[PDB]
Amino acid sequence: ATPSLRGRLARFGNPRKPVLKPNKPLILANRVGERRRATCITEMSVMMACWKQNEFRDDACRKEIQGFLDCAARAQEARKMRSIQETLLPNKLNKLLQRFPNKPYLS
Amino acid sequence: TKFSIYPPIPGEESSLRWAGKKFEEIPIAHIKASHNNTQIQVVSASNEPLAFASCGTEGFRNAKKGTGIAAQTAGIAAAARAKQKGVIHIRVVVKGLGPGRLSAMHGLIMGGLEVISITDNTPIPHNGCRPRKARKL
Amino acid sequence: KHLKFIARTVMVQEGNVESAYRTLNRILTMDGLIEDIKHRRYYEKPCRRRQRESYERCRRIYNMEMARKINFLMRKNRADPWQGC
Amino acid sequence: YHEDRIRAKFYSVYGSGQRAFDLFNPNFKSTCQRFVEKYTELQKLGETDEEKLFVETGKALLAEGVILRRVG
Amino acid sequence: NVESFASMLRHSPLTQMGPAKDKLVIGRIFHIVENDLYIDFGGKFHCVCRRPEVDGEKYQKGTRVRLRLLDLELTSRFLGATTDTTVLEANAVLLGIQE
Amino acid sequence: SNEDLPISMENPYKEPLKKCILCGKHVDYKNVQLLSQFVSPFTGCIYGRHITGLCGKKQKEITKAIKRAQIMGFMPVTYKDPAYLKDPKVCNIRYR
Amino acid sequence: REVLQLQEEVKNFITRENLEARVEAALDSRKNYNWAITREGLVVRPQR
Amino acid sequence: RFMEPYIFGSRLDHDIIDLEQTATHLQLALNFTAHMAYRKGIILFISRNRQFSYLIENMARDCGEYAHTRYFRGGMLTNARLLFGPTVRLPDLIIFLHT
Amino acid sequence: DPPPSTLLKDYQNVPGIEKVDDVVKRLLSLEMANKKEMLKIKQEQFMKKIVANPEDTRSLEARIIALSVKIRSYEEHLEKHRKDKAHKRYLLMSIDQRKKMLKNLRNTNYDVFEKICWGLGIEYTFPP
Amino acid sequence: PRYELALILKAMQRPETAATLKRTIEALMDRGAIVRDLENLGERALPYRISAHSQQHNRGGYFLVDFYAPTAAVESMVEHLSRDIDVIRGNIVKHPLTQELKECEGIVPVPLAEKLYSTKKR
RNA sequence: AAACUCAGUUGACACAAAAUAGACUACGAAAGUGGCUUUAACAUAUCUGAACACACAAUAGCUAAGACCCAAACUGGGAUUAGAUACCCCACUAUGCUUAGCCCUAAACCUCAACAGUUAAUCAACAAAACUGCUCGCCAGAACACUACGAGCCACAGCUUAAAACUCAAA
Numbered sequence A: 001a002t003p004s005l006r007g008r009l010a011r012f013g014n015p016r017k018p019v020l021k022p023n024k025p026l027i028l029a030n031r032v033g034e035r036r037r038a039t040c041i042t043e044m045s046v047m048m049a050c051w052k053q054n055e056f057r058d059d060a061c062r063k064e065i066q067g068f069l070d071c072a073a074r075a076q077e078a079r080k081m082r083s084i085q086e087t088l089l090p091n092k093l094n095k096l097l098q099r100f101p102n103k104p105y106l107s
Numbered sequence B: 001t002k003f004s005i006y007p008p009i010p011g012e013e014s015s016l017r018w019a020g021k022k023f024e025e026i027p028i029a030h031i032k033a034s035h036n037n038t039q040i041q042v043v044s045a046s047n048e049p050l051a052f053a054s055c056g057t058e059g060f061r062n063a064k065k066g067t068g069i070a071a072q073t074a075g076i077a078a079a080a081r082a083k084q085k086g087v088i089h090i091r092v093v094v095k096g097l098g099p100g101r102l103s104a105m106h107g108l109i110m111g112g113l114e115v116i117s118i119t120d121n122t123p124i125p126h127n128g129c130r131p132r133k134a135r136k137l
Numbered sequence C: 001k002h003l004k005f006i007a008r009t010v011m012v013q014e015g016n017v018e019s020a021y022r023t024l025n026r027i028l029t030m031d032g033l034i035e036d037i038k039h040r041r042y043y044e045k046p047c048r049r050r051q052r053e054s055y056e057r058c059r060r061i062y063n064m065e066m067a068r069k070i071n072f073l074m075r076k077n078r079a080d081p082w083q084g085c
Numbered sequence D: 001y002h003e004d005r006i007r008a009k010f011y012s013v014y015g016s017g018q019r020a021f022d023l024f025n026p027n028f029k030s031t032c033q034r035f036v037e038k039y040t041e042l043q044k045l046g047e048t049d050e051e052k053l054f055v056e057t058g059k060a061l062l063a064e065g066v067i068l069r070r071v072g
Numbered sequence E: 001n002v003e004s005f006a007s008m009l010r011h012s013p014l015t016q017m018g019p020a021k022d023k024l025v026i027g028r029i030f031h032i033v034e035n036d037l038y039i040d041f042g043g044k045f046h047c048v049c050r051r052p053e054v055d056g057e058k059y060q061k062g063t064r065v066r067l068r069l070l071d072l073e074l075t076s077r078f079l080g081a082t083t084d085t086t087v088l089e090a091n092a093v094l095l096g097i098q099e
Numbered sequence F: 001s002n003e004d005l006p007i008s009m010e011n012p013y014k015e016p017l018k019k020c021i022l023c024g025k026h027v028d029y030k031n032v033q034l035l036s037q038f039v040s041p042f043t044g045c046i047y048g049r050h051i052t053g054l055c056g057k058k059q060k061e062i063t064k065a066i067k068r069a070q071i072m073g074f075m076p077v078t079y080k081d082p083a084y085l086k087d088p089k090v091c092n093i094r095y096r
Numbered sequence G: 001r002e003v004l005q006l007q008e009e010v011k012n013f014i015t016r017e018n019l020e021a022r023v024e025a026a027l028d029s030r031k032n033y034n035w036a037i038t039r040e041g042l043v044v045r046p047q048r
Numbered sequence H: 001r002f003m004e005p006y007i008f009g010s011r012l013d014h015d016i017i018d019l020e021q022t023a024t025h026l027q028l029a030l031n032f033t034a035h036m037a038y039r040k041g042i043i044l045f046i047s048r049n050r051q052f053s054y055l056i057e058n059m060a061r062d063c064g065e066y067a068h069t070r071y072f073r074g075g076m077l078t079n080a081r082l083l084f085g086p087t088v089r090l091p092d093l094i095i096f097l098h099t
Numbered sequence I: 001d002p003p004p005s006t007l008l009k010d011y012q013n014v015p016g017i018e019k020v021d022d023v024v025k026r027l028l029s030l031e032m033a034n035k036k037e038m039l040k041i042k043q044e045q046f047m048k049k050i051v052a053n054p055e056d057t058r059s060l061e062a063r064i065i066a067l068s069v070k071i072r073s074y075e076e077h078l079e080k081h082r083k084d085k086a087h088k089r090y091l092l093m094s095i096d097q098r099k100k101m102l103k104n105l106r107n108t109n110y111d112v113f114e115k116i117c118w119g120l121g122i123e124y125t126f127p128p
Numbered sequence J: 001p002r003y004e005l006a007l008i009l010k011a012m013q014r015p016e017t018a019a020t021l022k023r024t025i026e027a028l029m030d031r032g033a034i035v036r037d038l039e040n041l042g043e044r045a046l047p048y049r050i051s052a053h054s055q056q057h058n059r060g061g062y063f064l065v066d067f068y069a070p071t072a073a074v075e076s077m078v079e080h081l082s083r084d085i086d087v088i089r090g091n092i093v094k095h096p097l098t099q100e101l102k103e104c105e106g107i108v109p110v111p112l113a114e115k116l117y118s119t120k121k122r
Numbered sequence K: 001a002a003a004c005u006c007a008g009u010u011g012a013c014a015c016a017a018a019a020u021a022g023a024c025u026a027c028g029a030a031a032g033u034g035g036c037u038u039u040a041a042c043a044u045a046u047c048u049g050a051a052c053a054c055a056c057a058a059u060a061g062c063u064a065a066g067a068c069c070c071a072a073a074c075u076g077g078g079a080u081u082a083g084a085u086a087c088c089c090c091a092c093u094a095u096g097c098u099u100a101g102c103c104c105u106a107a108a109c110c111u112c113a114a115c116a117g118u119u120a121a122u123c124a125a126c127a128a129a130a131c132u133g134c135u136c137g138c139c140a141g142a143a144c145a146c147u148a149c150g151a152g153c154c155a156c157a158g159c160u161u162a163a164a165a166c167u168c169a170a171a
């Protein structure tokens, strides 16, 4: 239940002092804001600790290195799949709102 | 029975156990995640200090203390000390939204110790003292 | 002075500390403690506190009204039933 | 309309029913409308107690064969 | 004796019906677009329900179905609007096919 | 003249106005069991009316009663009393 | 009625005479003001 | 606000247009339309209701008069001389099926 | 001040009120009531003593008497809460209102005005 | 008027508890209170540790003393309760039953605020 | 960097400030009022009515005595800087608090006076739609000017009232 606006704004016929002082008018706009914008560091830390304790000899850290590499590959795959899937959208939402726009005036 | 996220009530007859101990008797790992340092202290169920570890004591100095990596390092050190003092399962109480809040827990676990509970005891005055003034940069 | 380990305490299920921490942080956020601490770090002078509160109230009103409109119009996202004409 | 009182009481007492309205037929009569007609004729008989009228109308429709189910 | 508008309205099925909420009506699918079923139930507007996943193919133009109405017209007044915004379609729940 | 014209009356089809769950009931600072139904299980925070679903009057009554009990020693402050965690949930809050 | 009702009750008020007995009766008794509510507005009294 | 005189009353928040006024106004409108058609004027049917665009177009074509159910490019009437040609003849009557 | 044993205005007329337990009498007395009840008793006493028609309260006389009771209450209050600016303002405003009422009464019905002044111990002083 | 004294007494045995209740009701009657009823809500653990008169308390007995008193007696009774050592915490409140439950027909909803802004086109 | 060897757990403990409730919009004339309990208590059956008096008036500030957790003008130190009398970091004081007086200023602004009334033929622009009746206060180019003088004031680097001369065709 949206908060009431009865008697909240400084208006004539409103005895009490204003409750809200909206910087912008409280009128629904016909658009929505544009969607607003490290990975796999555990495996990296494991591999780097193994390197530190083994003098970075990859010979004795093969499992950790392979896990790190596969994790990076999966991170790339996740980025790609996420991008394609992301491609409701603000564009669609704005189109719908345009179809049914706000009317803050009299026709 | 079914799993409940709430802790058992002291004085109530509960079935949960850890290492043949009741919940009240599990040692407590007080984490303190300040803005630029993460301290850890594992006390017994009778507030007997067992292990200590802090970002500074781990060698980090200046800004490097306030890093999740430093928190993990301190947690691992504290967990090792507690493990050699004979601690398996711990109750974690962390007071502070410092950067080490969760990385300290991760380091503590990677040190071997198991966590049974997580408690937030961040001090939140009910409008008590007046904090220092804002920062204009 | 209250009993310890009853307030803001969560029990990890199977040892998934990450899940337990997520639940705890959800609790704190929904109760507002996180925002309260972030704001209490530095004293917010009463005028600024009132301005921020009023701004957040207006933002919530606008957001809730926009959400109501979006839900109300969501049923009209169908395909055009009179394509062409 | 004066029948609105009876309509509201009937809907509150028996719910919507099971005989769906067919708004396409101009001459359609809903179970509630039949109840209203029977209540109206009973009132025209000269019975003034509202609740007695209601129970009498319900029983008259039951005798007709209308299955008026009460909501609670 | 010529019935007037008042009498017609008084005896009309819509008037005989009370609030449309939770009222069962008989609609006639008059248009279908993929899985959307546009149903006319005698009211001003039409309700665009979805073809039920069960017995879906049985639903076709002219099919007579049963609806549980929720609003004869879907409208609401949003913040700042001087007039109600309408979606120009009724709201109903498609129960099934009448026989 | 004409009996088919509309008449001037109230709206007989009006639904009953919904009554808050506590409507008509006496909220008492001693009923810690009831007062604990509107406090966060973890932090003890009092729920807003958008969560409780109470009228303004009853929300104010619950607030005053909770504060009075907390300061008079009937009810814990920083947390909900564990003994009441299994009471019927009456708050539209989902922590999970 | 109000004065009449009060008249009846005053017979039960604790005085300097029936003080020991009433105190002991109070210590014996247990008064429960706790009762929860349900979403459907139905009281839930505790069991004793 | 201006439609109030023609509204018989609000049934459960649903306006009921006074069909008596509707009958009189429709009588006058049909009389005017027929008179223009007899006098051989140009009758243009305007309506943006896509649900009836096709029906309006077909009706206009069969009756021998013109129809514009599509997007109304600015100036079809004010700028007609330029958009079509200086000697174009504008409609003698415009009939709105949806104002 | 009326005697603490005095009964309240809602009980001084109850039949048989004197044939009840002294505990009931003490409960219904001013001894177990807030200051508003005592002020009501004072108001009714002044009315009986002064106004020709106590049952008429819309009269300027009844208004003046009630306002005088309120002035008494505010003065008693300030005597202890000397630093109550709000109630000091109320006292001054009520004195001004009573002066206006007394002016109107003196202009309209002199005999009644004289009786009001004598009964309430008010000395009408023409404004400078 | 009608007051209710909620009294958290030190956790003790029946003899001392009865003596303390007797002393408290005696103090009420001395200050001029007509004690109407005494109720025992029963001993229970204090929600939070209370330190009264150089003693940390975690359990206590809860008692309700409904009485009638002159207004000026409330302050004196509070002072005496503060003096008393067996009282972990005393509080005198106006009895809830003196207040009347106003009948709430329903939560009349506030419709959307209208005419906040001029209908001029912007 | 400077600063401290004070840091963590547990317990005891304020004359400081009053999370959540509050997505509530109430109280008061305005300033203001959001921990709890109690006492007293929120003027006017007609509206306006102070440079013409009375009573109030946030924060800051003075006087005298206490409290002092924290915050903090000034001050000192550490940085940053061409400089840094600032912004950033640390410490600490007046001060914020209680008592008794003073002081009587705020963008004290909802920049929208009080009362009664209308939504009809709109309305420079923006802002918080346009007006009617009645009353009081106020305004008459900019700047000089929250100024000088005179006057009053517990005010002594103050406050209230407050001009004029020169200047300009703008503001």
Ligand code: FES
Pocket: F018, F019, F020, F021, F022, F023, F024, F054, F055, F056, F057, F058, J104, J105, J106, J107
């Ligand atoms: S709903 Fe009736 S008191 Fe709130």
Ligand SMILES: [Mg+2]
Pocket: K049
């Ligand atoms: Mg006046």
Ligand SMILES: [Mg+2]
Pocket: K050
């Ligand atoms: Mg003035």
Ligand SMILES: [Mg+2]
Pocket: K057
């Ligand atoms: Mg001042």
Ligand SMILES: [Mg+2]
Pocket: none
């Ligand atoms: Mg100091």
Ligand SMILES: [Mg+2]
Pocket: K108
């Ligand atoms: Mg202000």
Ligand SMILES: [Mg+2]
Pocket: K146
């Ligand atoms: Mg000045």
Ligand SMILES: [Mg+2]
Pocket: none
């Ligand atoms: Mg000056």
Ligand SMILES: [Mg+2]
Pocket: none
């Ligand atoms: Mg001078």
